[PDB]
Amino acid sequence: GYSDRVRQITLGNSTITTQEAANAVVAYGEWPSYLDDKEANPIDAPTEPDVSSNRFYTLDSVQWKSTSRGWWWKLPDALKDMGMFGQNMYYHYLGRSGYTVHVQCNASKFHQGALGVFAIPEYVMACNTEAKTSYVSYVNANPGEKGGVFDNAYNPSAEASEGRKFAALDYLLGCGVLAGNAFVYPHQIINLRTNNSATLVLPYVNSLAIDCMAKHNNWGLVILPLCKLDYAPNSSTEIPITVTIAPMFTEFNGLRNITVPATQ
Amino acid sequence: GAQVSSQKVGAVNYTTINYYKDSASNAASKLDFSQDPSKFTEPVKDIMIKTAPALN
C-alpha cells in the first residue's frame, strides 16, 4: 500500500499531501536539530518558538512558461515576512533554522518538462557591473518571497550605480560555474511525466553554530527548467510553480528591539 | 633524557631533549595555566559572598 509517490508532511498546524512524489531528499543525509550545549556559542537562554514558527508558509506562486529561464530565492530571506517566524527572526540578533522545502508543480499526462530544484549553501551570485566587484545592494540581494529570476543573457550596466543587482545568468548558475554541475548540491527533479513535487529537508548549514539571519542567507533555492515546458495544444500555456517552506528546529538568541531593514 | 609532552592542538605529542648544561639555554617554559585573580579583584580581609549584601 505504502509508496514512494505518496507522502504526508505535518509541521505545526499545517499539512502537505502529495500523490506523485519521488522520495524525499535529506540534504547531506542530515536531519535538522537543535544546537547542543557542546557546540553552543551565545550564552543567553534561547527562544525556541516551535509550532508558532516551524510550520509551512506558502510563497506567492510563479508561472512556468516555455520561455522561463528559472527562479531563485534565498533563505531565511524568503520567509522574513512570514508570520511568527519573521517576528522571531527580526526581534533577535541571532537565529538558526533548518527547513522542509516543498516545491509543487502539476500538469497532465500530455504536458512535458523538467525542473531542477537545488538547495545551495552560501549561494553567492555575480553582480551586474564590470566597473566594480561584489557590488550588490542589500535590497536587491534580499527580495523576500518574490525571489528573482534567471536570464539567458548577461548585460552588465553602463554605470556602476545601475548594476547593483545579481547577474543571474542561467547556464553559469548566476555565479561562474556550469549549471550542469549543480547536481553536486542537494536536489530533486520535477519531471512532469513522473512527479508533481519535490521535497528537500535541510539542516542548518554554516561555519558557525548560529548567525545573523538579517545579514546572512544560509541557503539558496534554485529552480531551473532543464527541459522546457511543452504542451502541444498550446505552446504558450503556463503552469504554476508553488513553493512552500517550513522552518524547523528554530532557535534564536540576543533579544532586543525589532530589526527593520532598509527598503530602498 | 627525552621528554615527551602534549602539543597544542591545531586545525599529538612532541619530543624535547636539552642539549646545554645551563637551564637558561632551554626553550620556553611549558604552559602554566595557574591563576588567582582574587588577589587583585577581591583582596578583602573578610569573605564577601556574592548573593549576600556587600555591607551588612
Binding site: 550564552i43 | 579583584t41 577581591e42 583582596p43 556574592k50 548573593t51 549576600a52 556587600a54 555591607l55
Partner: peptide
Amino acid sequence: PTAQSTPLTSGVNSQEVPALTAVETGA
C-alpha cells in the same frame, strides 16, 4: 584548564541579590 563554562539557569525572585555590591571595599 579552560575558561569558564556557562551553567543552565533560569530566573529568580529572591532575597539573594548578586547584582548589588559595594566597590568601596576594594573588591
